[model samples]
Target: MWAFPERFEGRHVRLEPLALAHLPAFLRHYDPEVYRFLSRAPVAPTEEALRAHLEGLLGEPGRVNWAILFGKEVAGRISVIAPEPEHAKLELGTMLFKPFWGSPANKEAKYLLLRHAFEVLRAERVQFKVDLRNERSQRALEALGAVREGVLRKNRRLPDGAFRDDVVYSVLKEEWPGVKARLEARLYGASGNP
Candidate 1:
């Protein structure tokens, strides 16, 4: 079983488990467009519903979740969920406030989470699933060396009630070190933002 960290540090951001204090910013900053293909829409606008949703995840076992904080403000969230023993794998997901989109903050946050999944959790495989229509998400997963497994057609319905295909991708343990190297190079090399 995994427990949420008090905080996970990244180069440009810090990840802390979601708390009541973060709800205001989270509700205010998360753009609806960002949830276009997400399984659940951003937490319901009502404070009561948001708090209830937050409490549910906090209660789940083997789910490590964090609130992405840029300094003091809640910028988004990321989570690593352990699958059943039979699966012997973990699944990762991230959501960032639209204002931080395309920033190094996003890349660094993902790097930190992916690293923790493989190096700390010792996961056999790390899988990422994005809505098929979310090309940006697919590109980000590709940048991390997660190979496309296949498409899961009509896998889920988005908050908007549209059927969405899930684009599944994964990185196995054997391939992790090299993938880490590539991510670091891309994050720190000339191609990266200053």
Candidate 2:
């Protein structure tokens, strides 16, 4: 069985297991822009509905979710979705408040999550799938040294009732050492070598 860590600490950020207590902070930063390319619908307009939505995520099986924290504030949400121990693979997904986009918090949160997936969980493949229309997300995944495998045409239906191509990317176990070093350098401004 898969396990969720209590927390993942990094220089600029930390990831705590998702909880209802983080709901208020998340609601404060929630925006439709963050959901544009995501497969899910826009967030519930009412607090009660939103709470149920988040609670569903918390109750999901085969996944581990987190509240991305910058200092003591909730900056975003991230997850290891559909982890398959038998296949040694997992997918990375996240949403950040607009203010934190392209910031160190975003980078470090992903770095820490990838480290946990590959280093701690012993996953052989860490995958990322983005809507083909989400160029920014695709670029961000590329920057992490994940190889763009291919596009899954018409693989997902957006909330707008339109089909979307899902672009797949992955960093295999053999490539993780280099990928880790690159992420470290980007996050810590360290030398190229790990």
Task: Return the TM-score for candidate 1, rounded to 2 decimals.
Answer: 0.84
lDDT of 2 by residue, 10-88 (tens): 8788888889998897577767677678655445766775677678777777768889988878888898888899999
Which regions of candidate 1 deviate over 4 angstroms? 42-61, 84-87, 158-162, 189-193
Alpha carbon deviation, residue 141, candidate 2 (Å): 1.1
- TM-score per prediction, in order, is 0.84, 0.90
Give the Cα error of residue 54 in candidate 1, in Å. 4.0
Q: For residues 1-194, what per-residue lDDT tens digits would candidate 1 score against the true structure?
A: 54345778876788877766777875576456776665545456566755665666556677667888887677777877665435658888888888888767777777887787678767778888998889999988887788999999999975557687899999998888988888787677565535
lDDT at 15, model 2: 85
Q: Where does candidate 1 clash, by residue pair?
A: none
Lowest summed lDDT across 10 adjacent residues in model 1 is found at 36-45
